[PDB]
Symmetry: C4
Subunit: 475 residues, 4 copies
């Protein structure tokens, strides 16, 4: 520390002592405070426009399941099937007879498409199709079965009449069938213009009823899918952009203020790297050996590496959100994560504002001392925790529904050590008590030892590691 006491001990510095040494107003500091009030308000004005366009989308799918499926009651979306050979005829014919008489029984003013796509012809609106094996003759107890898997697509085409036969002659070959699908499209007008007070959207659905039979087990599940394709509709109206000028000028400010904060925060990371040369350069190997890949990262502080990354995640989400004016992108799964994960990192930066206080620093710096010791112990438990996942998946696998796959076993074993759906899993074991009573005896040894290891001892380590790292900050 020969020459640069004025400069190297100005880098390591509390921001409240900036006024005493030289003094300049915090135009560097309060720029990040603006980012709190600019990014959050962007998300609320976008999140309330996404909430409106889903509660209309998911309430046409419910209205499509009652008009197009035979005997649909609420709550049954997985147990709804067809078990006889005459219920599958009555489910296909009811889905078409309600399509050929749609604007006389349904309310909402839907209209047909006269489609010209790939699973349609030149003048069709409905296309029910079959898939089955091209050559097959199976018979149990006379075991000459021949399988050549090649799907045969025998589509049936019918058009909708509006202003005032060849599908009833349908054969399915039930010992050969794979699945029967139904394709049609409907256009509607979103009449939710109370909040917009301007031109609303014009939607175009795509309903897919699937009579899937892949298990070949005498059970055909029936479902319904939609893909709400959204674009503008050609209006003869005028002056839409009187209210459109209140939302697009606000989104380019985020492109500015997060990138204007990307200029200043990254430059502070350049200034921290030039002072690495000034420090070890004049320390000309004086204390033997200086750099051991730990003294270089002292200049690199963990808060500027967070705001630089949070500016990249924000600027990659604002460009995608501009694709709502007229652009033909339909991907809200990517656009919402890039805005959502960035907003998670913007808010946790306020802890740095709470860091420079002498009474909050004790409550935070224990989470930097214990953060190695907690994460070290999490590797001694995630070896044990992966042990009970493979043992429960193959023994309690055929008999129970909760223990079926490792995406579901690791959710039912992790919710059971925190105290939820516990007696439901014990009471489900006793439905197989008389049925193969040795599995029930192993399911009592499995569900008593796993629950009394991660609650009574392993959960009690995480209490003792924080308290053991709380006495070492003031004693």
């Amino acid at each position: 520390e020969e020459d640069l006491r004025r400069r190297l001990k100005y880098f390591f510095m509390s921001p409240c002592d900036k006024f005493r040494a030289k003094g300049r107003k915090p135009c560097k500091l309060m720029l990040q405070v603006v980012k709190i009030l600019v990014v959050t308000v962007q998300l609320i004005l976008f999140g309330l426009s996404n909430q409106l366009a889903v509660t209309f989308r998911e309430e046409n799918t419910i209205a499509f399941r009652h008009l197009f499926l035979l005997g649909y009651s609420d709550g049954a979306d997985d147990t709804f099937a067809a078990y006889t050979r005459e219920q599958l005829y009555q489910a296909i014919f009811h889905a078409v007879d309600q399509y050929l008489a749609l604007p006389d029984v349904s309310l909402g003013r839907y209209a047909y498409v006269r489609g010209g796509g790939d699973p349609w012809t030149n003048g069709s609106g409905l296309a029910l199709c079959q898939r089955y094996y091209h050559r097959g003759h199976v018979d149990p107890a006379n075991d000459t079965f021949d399988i050549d898997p090649m799907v045969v697509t025998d589509c049936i085409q019918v058009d909708p009449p509006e202003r005032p036969s060849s599908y009833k002659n349908l054969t399915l070959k039930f010992h050969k069938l794979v699945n029967v699908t139904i394709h049609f499209r409907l256009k509607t007008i979103n009449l939710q213009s109370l909040i917009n007070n301007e031109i609303p959207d014009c939607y175009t659905f795509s309903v897919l009823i699937t009579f899937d039979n892949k298990a070949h087990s005498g059970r055909i599940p029936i479902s319904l899918e939609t893909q709400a394709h959204i674009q503008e509709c050609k209006h003869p109206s005028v002056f839409q952009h009187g209210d459109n000028s209140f939302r697009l000028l606000f989104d380019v400010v985020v492109i500015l203020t997060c990138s204007l904060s990307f200029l200043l925060c990254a430059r502070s990371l350049l200034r921290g790297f030039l002072l690495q040369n000034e420090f070890v350069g004049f320390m000309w190997r004086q204390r033997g050996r200086v750099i051991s890949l730990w003294e270089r990262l002292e200049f690199v502080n963990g808060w500027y590496i967070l705001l630089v990354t949070s500016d990249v995640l924000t600027i990659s989400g604002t460009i995608m959100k501009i694709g709502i004016e007229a652009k033909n992108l339909a991907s809200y799964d990517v656009c919402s994560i890039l805005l959502g994960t960035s907003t998670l990192l913007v808010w946790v930066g306020v802890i740095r504002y709470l860091t420079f206080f002498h009474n909050y620093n004790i409550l935070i710096a224990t989470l930097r001392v214990a953060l190695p010791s907690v994460m070290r112990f999490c590797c001694c438990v995630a070896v044990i925790y992966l042990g009970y996942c493979f043992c429960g998946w193959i023994v309690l696998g055929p008999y129970h529904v909760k223990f079926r796959s490792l995406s579901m076993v690791s959710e039912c074993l992790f919710s059971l050590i925190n105290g939820d759906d516990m007696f439901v899993t014990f009471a489900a074991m006793q439905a197989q008590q008389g049925r193969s009573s040795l599995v029930w005896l192993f399911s009592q040894l499995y569900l008593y030892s796993f629950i009394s290891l991660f609650i009574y001892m392993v959960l009690s380590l995480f209490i003792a590691l924080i308290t053991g790292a709380y006495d070492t900050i003031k004693h």
Copy 2:
């Protein structure tokens, strides 16, 4: 401490040492003990009269949903709707045909109103009305839509016959409709006079059936509302006030005894302010600087500021409860909070009676040392906790019902760190596993990191702060 050792060290004083110095019987202390046995008994005699008048009110609404709605089974109050154009005709006509034949199928002896209100005429009892746009012609794929929002109120009036046509000619214009409401009123006699043994009340309901269609999505929810308007009914009977003299003389005692305790407790706050002049006045800036806005509030003790406020909340609730004899106020939401929040503060004052013991003081004064350190750490977590609310609301928003609004996200994320409805949220993510499988991967990173931060570390700080503030009271 020159002159007032007899007086300033009589203010700071344990109440059990009052007898030794001068000595007077505790007519100041035991007045608050009477307030325990006067306010609580007021609430139980009022709470058991409110319980009787609601279990009659909410069991006529259930009886109105079965008589007036077509196909109403229990448990369905949100999934009950109408999806075709003929089920809405059969739901309006069944609600009127059971109104024009009400005293021949229903038990309970209801009677009509012959109403003279604002949505009625001079001689009507039932008024079904429409609302629709005044000028509209929408059509998808021929996109000339014109909207001028102005509700048109085409009410239909019909009267009930009792002693031994123009509504069947109803058209709704389903591509233009907003909502269809139904207004009528019924009067009944509360025959629950077992506990009263005197004149009971006479009610007048107001049933509102709402065929609301605001989403314009092919789904019309059906509901029913009541506002039980309550006043007396003109009796030719005599001597009601033989049992009425057991409840109104007891309520003016609370007006006395809480205000007589407002005279003595506030005067003790005046006496604590005059001794502020006697203390710092004769300390004529002797130790440099005395008052720094912390030494003034030493005279202000936190228990007399609580009982003064609890007397204002009580006296503002006793005046409102007098409006049950003959007054025409109908507001129980304000009257019950003013009594309920006051009773919460009366009971916690008993801790002051448990404060002056040498074995309970250790168990309470740790909650005054740790109360800063817990509340400081709650500000370092409510910044993180508001981070995960915005990230979960826009990503897991369209796909799930629990994560729909911040009034519901902050209830499902807070119940998940205490161990409830945990596996229900994990099993609801896997219904969208094949459907857009990148959201499911983010919902595993979101629901494993949020749950292992506020249970394994942050919940383990609150254990270490109490223990760290429990060793500093006896070591």
Copy 3:
């Protein structure tokens, strides 16, 4: 300690040092070990005979609800009612037509009673009765109502024919009715003689169908009750007492061995009282003042006061269980508590056998040091906990079902601080969000402050009191 070092320091004594001083085999100690293996085996042989006689009793009530009630589906035992005036005629007539044709549609071989009781005549088996007000004429909007409460009992009597009219002329006066009940009895033969291999029991039920209308709110709940009256049936068979001699000789051993242990344990309490005279008698007020109501109870040890009481509870339950041979007592609610609470106290006496070990004593004597400090703090919380019960019962009372009475509020507030039915209570508040939106704002302040007081601080005191009383046993 002058004279009785041989005797007073033989009273205070570990039982493993009994062999070294004088020496006698533990016929005093191992008598209590026999009580472990005699009382527990009595309960299992009695508990498995009570389990068999209830699963037959509660599976005739389910079979009676399907044969005698119109439209009874499972799961609905509180929502089952009758809302129109014609459904109450069809529910009474179906309960009688299935009684007059019972042995032709029902399986089980039930038989009639030809009853001679108090609500019957000389030759009747079925008695449907009415109760209504003797003088009443109520009318809303012409408010001259007169009430004279006196029940009029107009019973209708009909007899069952078996070997090959005046009830159809029934009028109920629905604006005057109170309730309509139905009384009959059936006799059956318990054919579950697989485990008995001797004469089984012969039952006589009593079915009570109640069309109760006390609310007068247009809703009549329908229910069914049974009282299975049990005695012997007059058999011409012989040699029942070949298997009866395996269960009554085993129950008089408990009358002996618990009372033979009442002779020795109470005599040890007499011997502890005579040595109180020998101790303070020769201490002739030597150290000033000796007895201060704490030194007398040093001789009284807390384990012999437990086994004496556990012998009284056992001997009062064995006498009652003898009333199953031929005695006409029917009270299993008293007999099972006297056996159950006694068995709870027999098992916790084994801790005394684990007390005399130098490695288990540390784990138990912390529960005698902390047991004052935990119970002192439980009085500082049960004052706060009773505060939130009265505030939640009157504000969240009319709007919600869980917060209806203090027998239910104190179960829903206590299960919410341990982590169960938490999000169910938050999601039930938002069904009244638009309906009177100030109650919903108070229900967020009520259900966030109560849950973050008894989990984050008050639950963290009980961890700090045990740890603070665990360092004071070895440091």
Copy 4:
């Protein structure tokens, strides 16, 4: 320690110091690392072939309950019964009429058996049978009942016609019947050859419909059972073993590599026993007395005793899994436990690899110091915990369903101290509030004292034992 400092202090040795003394590459150590990647991949390739063969098995049983049972809706598998004498005729006849017309209404191409088993004749496919008492005449109120238990098996035989009467004359004797069963078998072809691309399996079911009446209580539960008998089906096809050569050569590697690791790990246990002779042999009773059955087990380390046992459990599960090629064994309950429990012990051996680090050893060796003290305290609680099981089973036994047997009481009392199904048990007590109101008062003393003993104190001992054993590893 005279002669063998080179040898006895080479046994006690960290494996990272093996290179410094003599030096050889870890072919002993990394063999166990191969066992991680060989046993786990064996379980995933076997677990995904068991998952496919169960989701076909349990989706034919659902398809059999809708085709063969009258009025079967989903969710009712215990409440489905028959209560009148005409519903049992309509349930037997519907199960046969859908069997004699099975290949005309059902999809899946099932075929009959023409069975030649023990409950069949020479040319039958369906066998409905009766069981009843051979001599019985019971009558209540004329109490001459005679019972001679001997089952009479009156089977009725009928054959299925395919290419284009004596069962309708059936009498059941309902006052004498025991149960009515139905036996038939069906063969189907598993058409799930997408993942196999070769010859699939050929199944043969066995459906058992049971009209069991053992309670004789007017309720006959109806159920359905299957035993999917699996073997090959005689194919005229060729070249199945092109894909079969990818799974059987991988399973004999586990037979090698776990037994090749059984040669080296057991030899290390032989070498630890020869050095017991070298240690105490040259210590010729020098320090008085050496071996006290604690110094012998110092050579026996707890990790080699675990891998030897885990090799026996693995080699006993690989031999059983070979019985899937052509062997006629059908026992997956034994084969999955021998693989599952072995895989649990393979994964926990990785803790030994995390043991030899100076920062993970503190987090693990506390679980060897506290493991006595936790297990000692678990014996002082499992005496109390067995006390509340017998007290709750006989008092809350007849009235409630959750407290019915000790296999269910010990699951509902253990899930209640961890915070699950808590308010469900409190709300179930209040359904018997008016009915025998002294049991309800005892159920509040029972469910408030048991829950505030094992959460507020006993759960707080396990936190204080870990923290008390964490300060004794670094202070």
